[PDB]
């Protein structure tokens, strides 16, 4: 029952230094850092008519990092003054595992989203900003995306107002929300 | 570090220059004159502070509800205290060994 209430925010590329300094001041990490991996979408849905995403990203900077496949579906339309993102599910796998499963179950590489950004942590909530790179196969927005994600079971939406207030605490940066 | 101290020194120098310009404008317009025209520029310097106010208005304002810069990071300070304590312990042991050696002679 691990749900998500991630808000969709986007910050201009020029406004980065003040942003990263604000983050490292308020809460970013213990000596924060960055990441580097490549995503891809697999589309196999004849009767469901819903391409089920799968983030088989390989962290190139990390050695032997597990492929953190992320599925997200059934967007929750709760209308509780929050993001109410789709229900998510994470799975850490090994090398060539996602490729083997795409070959066995039968998948198709819908598209590719190579992104790169910095890491951030909080007490419970999470936030992340990065920029996608429209590169070739062996290698298109070019804009930093500040997403305030909270991944946890259903619970009672008690952290919803807390996340809303913490996002409002960073109001001079962005005004994140959901999408259509 | 560098930029913060630079901006602080800049604000301090701006305040000092504003006070000096105000004092000069008072001394000029008090008694005796075209130089008094430059006294008007003193008021412009005041506007500079307003810009600094604007600079403080549209500043970082990370949370504006709590205090940023979580953690004193003084774990390194504690580690340095332990290192100095180990150095002192080694000095004491060396002094004891030296006293023993001198007594051996």
């Amino acid at each position: 029952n691990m749900m998500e209430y991630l808000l969709q925010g986007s910050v201009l590329d020029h406004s980065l230094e003040s942003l990263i300094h604000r983050l490292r001041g308020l809460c970013d990490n213990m000596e924060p850092e960055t990441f580097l991996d490549h995503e891809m979408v697999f589309l196999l849905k004849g009767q469901q008519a819903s391409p089920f995403v799968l983030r088989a990203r390989r962290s190139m900077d990390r050695a032997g990092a597990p492929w953190h496949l992320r599925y997200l579906g059934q967007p929750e339309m709760g209308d509780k003054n929050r993001h109410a993102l789709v229900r998510n599910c994470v799975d850490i796998a090994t090398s060539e595992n996602l490729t083997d499963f795409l070959m066995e179950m039968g998948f198709r590489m819908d598209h590719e989203f190579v992104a790169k950004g910095h890491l951030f942590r909080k007490g419970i909530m999470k936030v992340v900003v990065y920029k996608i790179f429209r590169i070739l196969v062996p290698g298109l927005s070019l804009s930093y995306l500040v997403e305030l994600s909270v991944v946890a079971p259903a619970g009672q939406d008690m952290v919803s107002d807390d996340m809303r207030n913490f996002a409002e605490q960073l109001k001079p940066l962005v005004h994140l929300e959901k999408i259509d | 570090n560098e930029r913060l101290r630079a901006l602080e020194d800049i604000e301090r120098e701006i305040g000092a220059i504003l006070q000096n310009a105000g004092t000069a404008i008072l001394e000029l317009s008090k008694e005796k004159r075209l130089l008094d025209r430059q006294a008007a520029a003193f008021t412009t310097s005041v506007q500079h502070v307003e810009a600094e106010l604007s600079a403080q208005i549209r500043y970082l304002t990370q949370v504006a509800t709590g205090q940023p810069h979580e953690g004193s990071s003084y774990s390194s300070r504690k580690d340095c205290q332990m290192a100095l304590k180990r150095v002192d312990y080694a000095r004491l042991k060396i002094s004891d060994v030296a006293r023993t050696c001198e007594q051996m002679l």
Binding site: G9, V11, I132, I179 | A51
Partner: peptide
């Protein structure tokens, strides 16, 4: 100095990047 109307400020551009944010479709 009577010609000054208002000292408007500038900041980031979230309104454009919001519509420019990527989505599923």
């Amino acid at each position: 100095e009577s010609g000054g109307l208002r000292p408007n400020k500038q900041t980031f551009n979230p309104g454009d990047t919001n519509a420019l944010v990527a989505a599923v479709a």
